[PDB]
Amino acid sequence: KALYDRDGAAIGNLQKLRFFPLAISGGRGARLIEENGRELIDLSGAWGAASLGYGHPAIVAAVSAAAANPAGATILSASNAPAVTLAERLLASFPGEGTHKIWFGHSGSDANEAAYRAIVKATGRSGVIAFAGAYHGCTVGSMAFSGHADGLILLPYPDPYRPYRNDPTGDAILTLLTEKLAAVPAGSIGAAFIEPIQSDGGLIVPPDGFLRKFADICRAHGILVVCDEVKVGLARSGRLHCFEHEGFVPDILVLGKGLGGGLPLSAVIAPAEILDCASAFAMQTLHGNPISAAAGLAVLETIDRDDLPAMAERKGRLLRDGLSELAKRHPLIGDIRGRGLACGMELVCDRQSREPARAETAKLIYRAYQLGLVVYYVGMNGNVLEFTPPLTITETDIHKALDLLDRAFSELSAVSNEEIAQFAGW
Amino acid sequence: TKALYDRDGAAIGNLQKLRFFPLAISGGRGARLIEENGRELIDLSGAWGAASLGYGHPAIVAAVSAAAANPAGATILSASNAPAVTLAERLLASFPGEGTHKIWFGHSGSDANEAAYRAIVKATGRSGVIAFAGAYHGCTVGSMAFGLILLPYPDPYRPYRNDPTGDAILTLLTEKLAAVPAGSIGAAFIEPIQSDGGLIVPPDGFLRKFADICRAHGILVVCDEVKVGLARSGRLHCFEHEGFVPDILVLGKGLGGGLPLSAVIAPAEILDCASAFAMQTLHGNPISAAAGLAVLETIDRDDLPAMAERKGRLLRDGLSELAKRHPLIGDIRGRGLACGMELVCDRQSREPARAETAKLIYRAYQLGLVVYYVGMNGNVLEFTPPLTITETDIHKALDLLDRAFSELSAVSNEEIAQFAGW
Ligand SMILES: *Cc1c(COP(=O)(O)O)cnc(C)c1O
Ligand SMILES: *Cc1c(COP(=O)(O)O)cnc(C)c1O
Ligand SMILES: O=C1CCCCCN1
Ligand SMILES: O=C1CCCCCN1
């Protein structure tokens, strides 16, 4: 009878990543509306896909006009204007050069896979560098180089809070890279996949200067540098593109989630020679469909119009300030990290040992949900709170979210172990 | 203010292009695409079958606008949401079905087919697959994976081992199964009308028989209806013409009536075997879900399978008259508004007329008609228009098609060469 019960009866568990019985019938701004009418503040923004929140007027206007008069439904066998305009608008925002083209998909998973397959096709080099704990997607293609393909080389992420080999600079990781590359035929690696802030590892910001150095090693060895900005892309970091923080330009940019503002949309920006090496090669019927592209353009127009990178920079300091405020009261909070409105809070059993507090995290978000706050956890040990709110979240929503979070830290023990065992999580 | 099509060439890479002619679209209304210059073309492609309700259908507009205005979140991964749930129930209500099956939502047929395969392997441990030569299950690593028993599709127009019944294909199948350990094959993937093969309806009874053999061996029957499902065949589900019910149904294309939306209908045990297993962030998103609902609602409300059956026969009847005037036409085939026309150099030899097929669609494009070719040989014109296409739209496209056949020589080899196509 209840919506959550009906979901359990109609929808298989295969795609479920449930942390609590959240059941939604509506949405407005940064709020989700449960079946009964209860309002929750969404600090997850659907893992960041709701870039502009819910029922944003520019999304509404864009998608309504597109549905009323659609330019076909595909970029495959026809050129359509909404997609072409979005392609140029994405091209404009990327420097360079260039000589770059767009490939459109439904998701970050299909875009990382396309990027890979295009590289191997265009160059003949099938080897891949990727980072341990990396999330590039859940398709057979994009999982092949995600964390636990032949010629896959996995490197530790440059994690300040847990430095590889206890070297805080990351120099040991670059040294490992170097040892790994010479154990493998010269010119055999075609690509290096990089998250500028590692999402699934625990929203990890790498040590300053590391990515630039890593890219320089890559460029010196013929290896194309692919920046997977699905989670942290498009203004979320407080800059239009997250690599703008790291003093390097990737050869390839992968975009997703927040790009569609609520509709399935991803994109690969890659040199023309990579995307033109084949035709009818990586394709799905509704790729570059006009309704998705219209929303995508409404996201970009709104980013520019509202200076959303500047907003995300502002609202992110406000959010991190408040979280530090909570650390001063709650010993579980070991680490606050992030850029713009991509923030991570690591919870630990002891601030010195930095041992992961998995059970408390699960109880925390469950309680948070009961209090009216939607936040999920992420990370290797399930101990990292992830904050990726709508970019249009108001300061008033953030203060309210902080008060509810404070309350959830204090009221955590209320959550029974059997309540938590109802929900498999990751 | 360059040409739209030239702007396309400069911004959008070739990787996903399946281009046969310089079609550049700025609008759509019913079964008509509106090019940049304001010429309306009758769409016989319906975007490979995705535009099941055509362009600007009121039901899609109402549902999409309302969903955009008040979205129940953006995902089904981490929240339950009402639109996704309502649509899942509705799809299960359309299948038999009750308490045995569950729904998994995707973006596309490729991911839906990939999810079905991964779920089966995970749930049953049986990684072995049976599939048909020339099958199209999608264009991702996961969906092009299908260890493998490959069979010829039973094509009445091109029989296997000189057996038009198709019984030699059932005999080959029996041999391959006997040759490999019992319980090593988990799934059989079937198109009940083979799309990439060139819209082939198999001989009567073959699939029913094929399904028996599978169940006899503990093999799950997966019916891939991404192209040909949802009212398109003259029934809601194409397997209803075939006297069997599949264990798993894959749905896509027309399902979103223009938005990306796919679905797998599978036994609960297959879909409940693991969690956080096959998932992408925008899966089950409410704007696609609402669009799926509008499609299912319109199908029932405007009796679209019956309309497809009517308009299909009228379309194929018209094409038989073209065959009386144009010797190129060798076989007209299909169910409902999913039809194929195989073009041959001799009706006895059944030798494929590839070169002439390309010119035909190029020519037809110039005339105001959107239509494409498929098949291993590039000689079968696919007809998959909006289930909404009008009786007037059909007659009008038949005249244009007639005119296209008469004017093939007007299109040169150098014009054909400018478009890479398949
Ligand atoms: C979410 C994400 C993906 C995959 O996107 P989906 O829409 O879930 O397929 C890939 N890479 C990163 C870094 C992501 O965050
Ligand atoms: C189109 C199609 C697919 C794949 O759908 P995409 O959206 O193109 O990935 C799979 N099977 C059949 C029969 C199809 O027609
Ligand atoms: O019908 C199809 C499948 C969709 C991808 C383009 C090829 N043709
Ligand atoms: O951050 C992510 C990627 C989106 C899919 C759900 C898993 N978590």
What would the 3-class secondary structure string for B362-386 be?
Answer: HHHHHHCEECEEECCCCCEEEECCC
**Residue holding tokens 């973006």?**
B107
DSSP state of B108: S
Partners of residue A47 in chain B, C-beta under 8 Å = 75, 77-78, 281
Say how far apart CA A171 and CA A173 lie, in whole Å. Answer: 5
**Contact: A14, B119; criterion CB under 8 Å:** yes
Partners of residue B69 in chain A, C-beta under 8 Å = 55, 60
Residue A88 sits at the chain B interface (C-beta within 8 Å): yes
CATH number of the domain enclosing B401: 3.90.1150.10
How far does the CA of residue B77 sit from the closest CA of chain A (Å)?
A: 5
Q: Roughly what angle, to the nearest 10 degrees, separates helices B206-216 and B167-178? A: 10
Q: Is residue B88 classed as helix, strand or coil in its secondary structure?
A: helix
**Contact: B107, A28; criterion CB under 8 Å:** no
- A174 C-alpha to center of ligand 4: Å? 28
Q: Specify the DSSP element, H or E, that contains B69.
A: helix B58-69
Of the candidates A84, A104, A257, the beta carbon closest to that of B7 is on A84
Calculate the CA B158 to chain-centre distance. Answer: 21
Burial class (CB in 10 A: 0-12, 13-18, 19+), A18: buried
How far does the CA of residue A32 sit from the closest CA of chain B (Å)?
A: 6
Residue ranges of B 285-324 with Cβ closer than 8 A to chain A: 285, 287-288
Query: What is the number of structural domains in chain B?
Result: 2
Tokens of A420: 């938590």
Is B259 in the same domain as B124? Answer: yes
Q: Please name the residues in contact with B82: beta carbons below 8 A apart, sequence gap of 6 or more.
A: A3, A23, A24, A25, A35, B72, B286
**Residue holding tokens 């991404």?**
B226
Residue A84 sits at the chain B interface (C-beta within 8 Å): yes
- In this structure, the strands spanning A252-255 and A224-228 are parallel
Residues of B taking part in catalysis: 136
Residue A137, CA distances (Å) to A114, A134, B87 in order: 11, 9, 26
Q: Are B203 and B209 in contact (CB under 8 A)?
A: no
Chain B residue with minimum CA distance to A16: B77
Instruction: List strands edge to edge, sheet with A23-28.
Output: A373-374, A39-42, A31-34, A23-28, B80-81
Number of residues in chain A: 426
Is B241 in the same domain as B204? Answer: yes
Say how far apart CA A333 and CA A50 lie, in whole Å. Answer: 27
- A230 C-alpha to center of ligand 1: Å? 6
Residue-range definition of the domain harbouring residue A295:
56-306
Q: How many CB atoms sit inside 10 A of residue B37's CB?
A: 9
Q: Are A40 and A372 in contact (CB under 8 A)?
A: yes
Residues of A taking part in catalysis: 135
- In this structure, the strands spanning B380-383 and B338-346 are antiparallel
Ligand number with the minimum distance to the CA of A16:
4
Residue B88, CA distances (Å) to A14, B259, B269, B324 in order: 14, 17, 17, 47
Phi, psi of A194 (to 5 degrees): -130, 130
Chain B residue with minimum CA distance to A44: B78
Is A120 in the same domain as A212? Answer: yes
DSSP state of B219: P
Is A221 in the same domain as A89? Answer: yes
Residue A2 sits at the chain B interface (C-beta within 8 Å): no
Q: Are B416 and B409 in contact (CB under 8 A)?
A: no
Burial class (CB in 10 A: 0-12, 13-18, 19+), A207: middle
Say how far apart CA B214 and CA B173 lie, in whole Å. Answer: 10
Number of helices (H) and strands (E) in chain A: give both, helices first: 13, 16
Chains A–B, number of C-beta pairs less than 8 Å apart: 387
| A365 DSSP β-pair partners | none
Q: Are A341 and A319 in contact (CB under 8 A)?
A: yes
Method: X-ray
Say how far apart CA A232 and CA A234 lie, in whole Å. Answer: 7
Ligand number with the minimum distance to the CA of B253:
2
Domain boundary residue among A246, A275, A306?
A: A306
Residue ranges of B 371-400 with Cβ closer than 8 A to chain A: 372
* Per-residue b or e along A245-270, where b marks 16 or more CB atoms closer than 10 Å to that residue's CB: bbebbbbbbbbbbbbbbbbbbbbbbb
Beta strands in A208-341 (DSSP E): 224-228, 252-255, 266-271, 333-339
Which of B19, B110, B139 gets mutated to test ligand 3 (max ligand atoms within 8 A of its CB)? Answer: B139
Is B295 in the same domain as B170? Answer: yes
Q: How many CB atoms sit inside 10 A of residue A273's CB?
A: 13
Is B346 in the same domain as B290? Answer: no
Chain A residue with minimum CA distance to B262: A286
* Per-residue b or e along A364-397, where b marks 16 or more CB atoms closer than 10 Å to that residue's CB: bbbbbbbebbbbbbbbbebbbbbbbbbbbbeeeb
Say how far apart CA A144 and CA B119 lie, in whole Å. Answer: 17
Say how far apart CA B63 and CA B76 lie, in whole Å. Answer: 18
Which of A15, A17, A374 gets mutated to test ligand 4 (max ligand atoms within 8 A of its CB)? Answer: A17
Say how far apart CA B148 and CA B2 lie, in whole Å. Answer: 49
Closest CA to A385 of A336, A330, A326, A313: A336
Stated in angstroms to one decimal place, the resolution of this structure is 2.4
Of the candidates B28, B85, B260, the beta carbon closest to that of A72 is on B28
Partners of residue B43 in chain A, C-beta under 8 Å = 72
How far does the CA of residue B253 sit from the closest CA of chain A (Å)?
A: 7
Identity (one letter) of the amino acid at A119?
A: I
- B281 C-alpha to center of ligand 4: Å? 6
CATH number of the domain enclosing A78: 3.40.640.10
Closest CA to B152 of B378, B383, B376: B376
Domain boundary residue among A248, A276, A306?
A: A306
Burial class (CB in 10 A: 0-12, 13-18, 19+), A152: middle
Is B46 in the same domain as B107? Answer: no
Partners of residue A71 in chain B, C-beta under 8 Å = 25-28, 33
* Per-residue b or e along A97-121, where b marks 16 or more CB atoms closer than 10 Å to that residue's CB: eeebbbbbbbbbbbbbbbbbbbbbb
First to last CA, chain B: 30
Q: Are B387 and B309 in contact (CB under 8 A)?
A: no
Is A164 in the same domain as A266? Answer: yes
Residue A363 sits at the chain B interface (C-beta within 8 Å): no
| Residue A97 preceded by cis peptide, ω within 30 | yes
Closest CA to A105 of A311, A327, A288, A304: A288
- B143 C-alpha to center of ligand 2: Å? 10
**Contact: A260, B282; criterion CB under 8 Å:** yes
Q: Specify the DSSP element, H or E, that contains A60.
A: helix A57-68
Of the candidates B145, B275, B370, the beta carbon closest to that of A13 is on B275
**Contact: A107, B280; criterion CB under 8 Å:** yes
Ligand number with the minimum distance to the CA of B222:
2
Domain boundary residue among B302, B320, B340?
A: B302
Q: Roughly what angle, to the nearest 10 degrees, separates helices B4-11 and A81-92? A: 40
Identity (one letter) of the amino acid at A184?
A: V
Q: How many CB atoms sit inside 10 A of residue A416's CB?
A: 11
Identity (one letter) of the amino acid at B368?
A: G
Is A294 in the same domain as A318? Answer: no
Is A313 in the same domain as A255? Answer: no
Say how far apart CA B287 and CA B277 lie, in whole Å. Answer: 23
Chain A residue with minimum CA distance to B42: A72
**Residue holding tokens 């002439």?**
B356
Say how far apart CA B151 and CA B132 lie, in whole Å. Answer: 5
Is B87 in the same domain as B48? Answer: no
Which residues of B are documented as binding site for pyridoxal 5'-phosphate?
109-110, 136, 224-227, 281
SS3 for B130-182 is EEECCCCCCCCCCCCCCCEEEECCCCCCCCECCECCCHHHHHHHHHHHHCCCC
Say how far apart CA A190 and CA A120 lie, in whole Å. Answer: 7
Say how far apart CA B365 and CA B419 lie, in whole Å. Answer: 13
Q: Are A234 and A261 in contact (CB under 8 A)?
A: no
Kindly tell me the sign of the dihedral angle through the C-alpha atoms of B123, B124, B129, B130: negative
Is A221 in the same domain as A320? Answer: no
How far does the CA of residue B158 sit from the closest CA of chain A (Å)?
A: 27
